Amino acid sequence: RVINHPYYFPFNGKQAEDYLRSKERGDFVIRQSSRGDDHLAITWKLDKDLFQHVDIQELEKENPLALGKVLVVEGQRYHDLDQIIVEYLQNKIRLLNELTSNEKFKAGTKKEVVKFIEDYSKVNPKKSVYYFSLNYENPGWFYLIFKLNAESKLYIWNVKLTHTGFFLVNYNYPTVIQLCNGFKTLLKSSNTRN
DSSP states (O other), rough: OOOOOOTEEEHHHHHHHHTTTTOOOEEEEEEOOOOOEEEEEEEEEEHHHHHHEEEEEEEEOOSTTTTOOOETTTEEEEESSHIIIIIIIIHHHHHHHHHHTTTTEEEEEEEEEHHHHHHHHHHTOOOOEEEEOTTEEETTTTEOOOOTTTSSSSEEEEEEEOSSSSSTEEEEESSHHHHHHHHHHHHGGGGGOO
């Protein structure tokens, strides 16, 4: 099949990661999808050795080898690859940077952030604390690690980066501020939220 786009190469996933390894956060390629001929894929770089592969489903192809008139990414329809780059990918990159730039974002591993929170709770036994960190084994996820006070357990919740915001439990929170507010609401019993 023929795809006329500046960032299209018929790589597989591994080739794509090797190609992007020396690039920067947000750099990407459009590529061949593993199995099928009505699929394409985008691989993009989130961080050092951290890449996400995004599937594109085609609809309304004139024939097996033709580019679909409608392209679907994570449940959303788009007209073409350039629209996906502007409305889907650039958004996801925006949101990734919004979260990692936050004062409550911690670089470092799950274990490191858990230890930071344990230690902090030791010193401030009455103060709640929470941090976000990158899930390095499941690209595109974040940990939300928190502890209410010294008498309570440390917990780990999970946040998924989407093109519309940060998915936590129920909603796709469109900003980091709304995400933290939503987290705080989810800490309350259901009958004392509103």
